Subunit: 114 residues, 4 copies
């Protein structure tokens, strides 16, 4: 599995379960094409987004829809979502984990690449 | 000054000087309109982005063009940029500082609201 | 002012006001000597910790007592405090801002050096 | 496995492999007793630190010796180490993952509790 997303909740100290994640790929157009999407599991992880055949060199944007999540825990947040834009597979295919740590007024994101 | 952006470099432990910052506002269209832009100063700060007259309730996206910055320090980074999407002035006008801490494979962003 | 500490609250999106901060310096003993302390102001900042005469090369530990702060906002946190250990003035005297961003189950710390 | 530590490198976008981790527990003395220690594996993870029998309610400090790690990648860092102090098992036994994301001038730490 070449691209996985993991999301953590800094407020409850737990995985963020059932969070919506959308992945876009920048086309030759200079437009964002919808690439893949899904919701995180009980472990805060989302696997099965894509296959190594489909996941080519390019510029990707990962959007994590965090505002719904925060409402659903009784919280009126501030961000519309968390977004991460990165270039992928530039050096040949890699395994990428894009991880996000969420708080109402802040977030951190990191890529772990193997 | 109702909206200011501050950018820090986690690699050199210093302000990120002369970084490009673009602000967009979501229009009734559901399109991003260009709202304001500029480059950070020697202190890593960008003031004068807007006036309190122009800075109304709405959804804003702040894009920090970090890839140029990292190249200019001799570094091939991973993100195309850092992006922060948030709703503003929902509760009446506030002063917003959107701060970003940059590393090649990671970033953190926070809003400080007064 | 050669050493300043700034503390932000990721939960309320605001400065952390009236937070206790203790600074220790490692002695020849290999013991921590109490070096300086104080509480953050309404801006989340603590200035006047030391003078450039007193702030010599050495290993320092900055401890931010965050648990009291979180209780005082109605919150039972997880960390006893945030701690940052660093070597100072190794390359000649600098101005150091040690900044901390707090959440109940997480924190980030950075040094900005001039 | 009730306590595990994971360490990530924000500079290389990878796990931090073979990093030293020491765990201390605050005794009735108000002294830190050495509780457990080990080095992270190729995945940046350290398991087998303790057993659920030994891991009781108390105040723990996790110290990650990051300075050696940064030297070993050709880097003169700033922190002596990363330290996390927290209260454990206060509400009955939990599984705790203490995760740390490292950069030369910054770090973030979070607890994920199950
Ligand atoms: C995500 C993040 C975390 C920490 C910092 C940060 O270190 C910082 C430092 C400052 O001197 C300062 O004035 C502010 N601010 O006003 O927000 C932030 C900046 C961004
Ligand atoms: C402070 C911080 C922020 C983000 C990460 C982080 O990126 C991360 C990545 C993982 O694959 C993973 O399994 C976990 N975890 O279990 O906690 C954390 C780690 C630490």
């Amino acid at each position: 599995c070449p691209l996985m997303v993991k999301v953590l909740d800094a407020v409850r100290g737990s995985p963020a379960i059932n969070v919506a994640v959308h992945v876009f790929r920048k086309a030759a157009d200079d437009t964002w094409e919808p690439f893949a999407s899904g919701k995180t599991s009980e472990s805060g992880e989302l696997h099965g987004l894509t296959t190594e055949e489909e996941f080519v060199e390019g510029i990707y944007k990962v959007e994590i829809d965090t505002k719904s999540y925060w409402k659903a825990l009784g919280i009126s947040p501030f961000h519309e979502h968390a977004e991460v834009v990165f270039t992928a597979n530039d050096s040949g295919p890699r395994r990428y984990t894009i991880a996000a740590l969420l708080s109402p007024y802040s977030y951190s994101t990191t890529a772990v690449i193997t």
